[PDB]
Tab-separated table of N, CA and C in Angstrom:
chain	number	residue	atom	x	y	z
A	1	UNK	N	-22.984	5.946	38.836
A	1	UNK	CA	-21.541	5.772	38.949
A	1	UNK	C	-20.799	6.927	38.267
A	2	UNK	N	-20.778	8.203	39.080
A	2	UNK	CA	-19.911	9.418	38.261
A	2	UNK	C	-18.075	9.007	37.995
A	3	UNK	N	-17.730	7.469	38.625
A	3	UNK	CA	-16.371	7.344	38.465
A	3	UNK	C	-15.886	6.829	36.957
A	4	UNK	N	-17.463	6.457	36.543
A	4	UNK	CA	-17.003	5.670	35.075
A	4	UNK	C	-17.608	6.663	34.113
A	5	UNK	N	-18.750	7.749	34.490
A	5	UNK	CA	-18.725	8.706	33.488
A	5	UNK	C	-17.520	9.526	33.240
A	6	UNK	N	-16.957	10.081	34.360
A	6	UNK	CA	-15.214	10.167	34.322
A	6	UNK	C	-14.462	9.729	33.349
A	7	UNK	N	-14.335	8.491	33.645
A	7	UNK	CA	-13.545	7.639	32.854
A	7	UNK	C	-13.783	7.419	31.276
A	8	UNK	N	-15.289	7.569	31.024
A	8	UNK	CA	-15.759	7.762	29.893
A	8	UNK	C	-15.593	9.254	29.150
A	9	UNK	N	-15.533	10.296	29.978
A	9	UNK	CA	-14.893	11.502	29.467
A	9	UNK	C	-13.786	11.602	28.897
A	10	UNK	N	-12.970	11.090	30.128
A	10	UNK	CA	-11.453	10.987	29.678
A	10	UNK	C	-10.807	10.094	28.487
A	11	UNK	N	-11.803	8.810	28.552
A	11	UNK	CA	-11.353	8.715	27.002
A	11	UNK	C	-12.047	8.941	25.877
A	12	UNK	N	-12.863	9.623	25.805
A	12	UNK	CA	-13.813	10.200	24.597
A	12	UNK	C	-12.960	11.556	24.490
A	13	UNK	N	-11.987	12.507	25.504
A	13	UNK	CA	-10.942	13.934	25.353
A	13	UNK	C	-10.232	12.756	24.678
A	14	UNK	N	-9.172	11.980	24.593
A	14	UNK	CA	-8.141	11.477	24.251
A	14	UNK	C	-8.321	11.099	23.100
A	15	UNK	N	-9.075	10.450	22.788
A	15	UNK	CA	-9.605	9.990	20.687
A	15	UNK	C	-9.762	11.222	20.484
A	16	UNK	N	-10.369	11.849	20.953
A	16	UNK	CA	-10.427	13.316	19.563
A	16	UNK	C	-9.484	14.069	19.886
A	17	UNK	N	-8.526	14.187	20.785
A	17	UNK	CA	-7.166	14.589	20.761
A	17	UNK	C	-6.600	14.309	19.191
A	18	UNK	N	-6.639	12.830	19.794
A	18	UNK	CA	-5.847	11.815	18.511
A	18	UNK	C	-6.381	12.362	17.306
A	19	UNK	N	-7.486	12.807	17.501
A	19	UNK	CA	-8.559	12.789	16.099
A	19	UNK	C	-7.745	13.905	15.608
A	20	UNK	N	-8.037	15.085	16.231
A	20	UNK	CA	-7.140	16.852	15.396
A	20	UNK	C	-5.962	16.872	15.493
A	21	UNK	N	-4.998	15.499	15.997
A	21	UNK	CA	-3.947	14.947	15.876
A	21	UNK	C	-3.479	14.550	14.089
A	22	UNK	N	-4.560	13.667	14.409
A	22	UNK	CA	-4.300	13.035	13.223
A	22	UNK	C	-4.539	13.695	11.651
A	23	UNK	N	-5.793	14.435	11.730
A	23	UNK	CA	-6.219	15.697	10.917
A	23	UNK	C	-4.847	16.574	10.721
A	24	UNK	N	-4.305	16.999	11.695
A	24	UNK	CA	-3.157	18.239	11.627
A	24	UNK	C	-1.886	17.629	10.819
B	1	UNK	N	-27.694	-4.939	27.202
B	1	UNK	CA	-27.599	-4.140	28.540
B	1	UNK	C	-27.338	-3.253	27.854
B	2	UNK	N	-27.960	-2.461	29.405
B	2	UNK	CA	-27.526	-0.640	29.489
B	2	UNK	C	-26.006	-0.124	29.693
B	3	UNK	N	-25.770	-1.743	30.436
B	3	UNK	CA	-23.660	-1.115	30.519
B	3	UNK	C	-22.739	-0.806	29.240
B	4	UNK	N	-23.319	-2.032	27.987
B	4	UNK	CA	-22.774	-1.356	26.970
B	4	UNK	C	-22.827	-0.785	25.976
B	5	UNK	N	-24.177	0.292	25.976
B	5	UNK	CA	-24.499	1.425	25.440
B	5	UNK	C	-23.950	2.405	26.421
B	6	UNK	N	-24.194	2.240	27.718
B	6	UNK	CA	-23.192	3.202	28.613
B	6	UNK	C	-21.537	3.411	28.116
B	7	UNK	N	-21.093	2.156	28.285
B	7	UNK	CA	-19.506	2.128	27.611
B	7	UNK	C	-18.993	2.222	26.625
B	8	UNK	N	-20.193	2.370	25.295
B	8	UNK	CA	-19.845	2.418	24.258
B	8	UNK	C	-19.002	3.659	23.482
B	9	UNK	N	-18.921	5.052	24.041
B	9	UNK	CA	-17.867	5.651	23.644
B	9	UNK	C	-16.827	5.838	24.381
B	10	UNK	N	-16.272	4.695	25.329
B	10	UNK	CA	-15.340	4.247	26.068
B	10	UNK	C	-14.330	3.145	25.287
B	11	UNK	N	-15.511	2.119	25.088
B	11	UNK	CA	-14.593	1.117	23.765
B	11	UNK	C	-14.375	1.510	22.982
B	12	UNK	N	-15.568	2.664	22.097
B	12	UNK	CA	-14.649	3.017	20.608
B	12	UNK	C	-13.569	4.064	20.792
B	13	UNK	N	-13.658	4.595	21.914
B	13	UNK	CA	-12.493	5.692	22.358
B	13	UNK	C	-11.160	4.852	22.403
B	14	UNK	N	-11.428	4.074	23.380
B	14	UNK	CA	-10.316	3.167	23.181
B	14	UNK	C	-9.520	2.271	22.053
B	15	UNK	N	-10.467	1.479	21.440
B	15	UNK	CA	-10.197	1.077	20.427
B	15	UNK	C	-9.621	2.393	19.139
B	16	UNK	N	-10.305	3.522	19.355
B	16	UNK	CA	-9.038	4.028	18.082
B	16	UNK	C	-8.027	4.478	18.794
B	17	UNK	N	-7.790	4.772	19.987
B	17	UNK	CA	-6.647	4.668	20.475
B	17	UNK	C	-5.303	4.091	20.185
B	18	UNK	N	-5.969	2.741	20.343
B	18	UNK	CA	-5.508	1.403	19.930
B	18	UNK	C	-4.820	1.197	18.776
B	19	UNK	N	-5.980	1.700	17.764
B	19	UNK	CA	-5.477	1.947	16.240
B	19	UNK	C	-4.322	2.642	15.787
B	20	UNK	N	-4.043	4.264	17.178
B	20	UNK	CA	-3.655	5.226	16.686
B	20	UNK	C	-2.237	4.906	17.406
B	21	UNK	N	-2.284	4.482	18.157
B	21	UNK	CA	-0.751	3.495	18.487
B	21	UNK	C	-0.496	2.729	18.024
B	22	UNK	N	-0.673	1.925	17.154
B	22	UNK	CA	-0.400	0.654	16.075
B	22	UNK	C	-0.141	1.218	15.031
B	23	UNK	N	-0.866	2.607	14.489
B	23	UNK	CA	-0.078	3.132	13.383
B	23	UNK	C	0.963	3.562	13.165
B	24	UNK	N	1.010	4.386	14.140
B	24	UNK	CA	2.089	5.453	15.200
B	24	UNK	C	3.901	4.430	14.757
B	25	UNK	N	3.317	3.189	15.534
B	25	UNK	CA	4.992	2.357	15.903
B	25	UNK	C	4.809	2.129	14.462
B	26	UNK	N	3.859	1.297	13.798
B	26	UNK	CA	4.316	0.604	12.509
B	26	UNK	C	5.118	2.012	11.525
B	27	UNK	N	4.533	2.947	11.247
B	27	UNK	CA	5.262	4.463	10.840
B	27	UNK	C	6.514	4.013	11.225
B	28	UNK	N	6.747	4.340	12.706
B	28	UNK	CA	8.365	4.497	13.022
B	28	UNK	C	8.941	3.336	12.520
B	29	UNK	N	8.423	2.168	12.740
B	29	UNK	CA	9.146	0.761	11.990
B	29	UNK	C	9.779	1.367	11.011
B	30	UNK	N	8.850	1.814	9.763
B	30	UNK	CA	9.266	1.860	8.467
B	30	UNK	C	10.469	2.616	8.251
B	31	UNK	N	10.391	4.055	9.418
B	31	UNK	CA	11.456	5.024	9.172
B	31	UNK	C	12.557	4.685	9.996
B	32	UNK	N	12.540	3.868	11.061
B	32	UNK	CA	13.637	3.225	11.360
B	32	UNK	C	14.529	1.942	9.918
B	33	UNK	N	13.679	1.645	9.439
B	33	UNK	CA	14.067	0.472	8.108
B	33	UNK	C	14.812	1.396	7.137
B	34	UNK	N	14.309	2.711	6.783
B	34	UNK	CA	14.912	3.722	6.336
B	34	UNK	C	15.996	3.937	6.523
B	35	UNK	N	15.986	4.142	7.650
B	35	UNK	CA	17.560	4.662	8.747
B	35	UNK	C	18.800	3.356	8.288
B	36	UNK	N	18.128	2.022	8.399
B	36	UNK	CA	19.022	1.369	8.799
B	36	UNK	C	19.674	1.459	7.548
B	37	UNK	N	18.720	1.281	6.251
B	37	UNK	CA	19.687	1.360	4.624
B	37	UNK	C	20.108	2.333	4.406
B	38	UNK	N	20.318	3.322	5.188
B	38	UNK	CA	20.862	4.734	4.651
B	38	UNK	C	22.292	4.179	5.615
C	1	UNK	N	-20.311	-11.246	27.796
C	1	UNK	CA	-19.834	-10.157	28.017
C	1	UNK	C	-18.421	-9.827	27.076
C	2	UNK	N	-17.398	-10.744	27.641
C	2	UNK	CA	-16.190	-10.449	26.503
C	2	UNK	C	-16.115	-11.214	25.849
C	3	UNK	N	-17.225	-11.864	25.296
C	3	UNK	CA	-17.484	-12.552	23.877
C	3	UNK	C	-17.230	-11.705	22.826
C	4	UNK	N	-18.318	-10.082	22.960
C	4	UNK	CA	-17.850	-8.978	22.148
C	4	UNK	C	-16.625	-9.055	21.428
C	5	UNK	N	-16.033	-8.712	20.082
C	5	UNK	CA	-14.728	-8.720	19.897
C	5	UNK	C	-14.308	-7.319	20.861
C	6	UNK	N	-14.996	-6.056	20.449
C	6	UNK	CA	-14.564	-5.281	20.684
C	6	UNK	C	-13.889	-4.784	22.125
C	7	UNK	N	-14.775	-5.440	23.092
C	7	UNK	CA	-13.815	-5.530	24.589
C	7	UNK	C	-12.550	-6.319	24.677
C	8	UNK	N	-12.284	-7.247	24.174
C	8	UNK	CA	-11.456	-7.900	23.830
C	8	UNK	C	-10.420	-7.471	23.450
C	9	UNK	N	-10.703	-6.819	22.001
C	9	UNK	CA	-10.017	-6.115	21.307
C	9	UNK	C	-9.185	-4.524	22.205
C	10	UNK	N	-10.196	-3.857	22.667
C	10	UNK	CA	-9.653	-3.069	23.687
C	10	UNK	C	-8.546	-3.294	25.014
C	11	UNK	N	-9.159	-4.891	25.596
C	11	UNK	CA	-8.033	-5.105	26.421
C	11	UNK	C	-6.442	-5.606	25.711
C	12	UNK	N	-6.466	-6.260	24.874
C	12	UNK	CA	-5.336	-6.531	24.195
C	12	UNK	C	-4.444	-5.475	23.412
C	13	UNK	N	-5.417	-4.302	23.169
C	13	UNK	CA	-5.018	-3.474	22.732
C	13	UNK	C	-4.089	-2.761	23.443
C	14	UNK	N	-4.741	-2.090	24.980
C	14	UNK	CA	-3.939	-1.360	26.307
C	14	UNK	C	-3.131	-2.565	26.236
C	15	UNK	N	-3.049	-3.758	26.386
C	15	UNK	CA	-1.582	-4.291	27.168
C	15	UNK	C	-0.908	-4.326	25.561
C	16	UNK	N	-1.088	-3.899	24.988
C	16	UNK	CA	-0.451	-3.849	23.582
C	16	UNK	C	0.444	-2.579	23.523
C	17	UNK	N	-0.247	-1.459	24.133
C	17	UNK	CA	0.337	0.158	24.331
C	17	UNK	C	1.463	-0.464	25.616
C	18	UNK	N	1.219	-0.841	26.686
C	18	UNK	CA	1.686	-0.874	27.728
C	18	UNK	C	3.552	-1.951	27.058
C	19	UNK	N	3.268	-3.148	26.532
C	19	UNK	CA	4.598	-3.696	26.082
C	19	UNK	C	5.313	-2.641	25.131
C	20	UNK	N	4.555	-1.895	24.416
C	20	UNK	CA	5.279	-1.315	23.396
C	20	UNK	C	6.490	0.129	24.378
C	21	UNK	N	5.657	0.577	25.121
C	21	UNK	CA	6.487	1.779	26.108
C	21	UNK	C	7.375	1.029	26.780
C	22	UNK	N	6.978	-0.401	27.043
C	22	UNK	CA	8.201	-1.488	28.424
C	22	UNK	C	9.463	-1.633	27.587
């Protein structure tokens, strides 16, 4: 199912967004 | 199951998400409470 | 399955983001 590894990308980019978000 | 070791950095992705929007508003709460006694 | 807290916790969470932007 490459639609939910997708989906699993996209929110594993978004927490560590948050993450050097939150760091900064 | 394999689905939720598969999903598992999906929920915790999400879940601090979760966290990081609950902090986020409660913050603004406070500095809105600020605002209002000033 | 959503015995887990943590799925749980995740769905309540998104409709938690979603009221807060409404």
């Amino acid at each position: 199912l490459p639609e939910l590894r997708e989906v699993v990308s996209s929110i594993s980019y978004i927490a560590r967004q948050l993450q050097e978000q939150e760091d900064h | 199951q394999e689905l939720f070791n598969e999903l598992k950095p999906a929920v915790d992705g999400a879940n601090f998400i979760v966290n990081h929007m609950r902090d986020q508003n409660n913050y603004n709460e406070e500095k809105d409470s600020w605002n209002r006694v000033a | 399955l959503i015995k887990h807290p943590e799925v749980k916790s995740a769905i309540e969470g998104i409709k938690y983001i979603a009221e807060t932007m409404k």
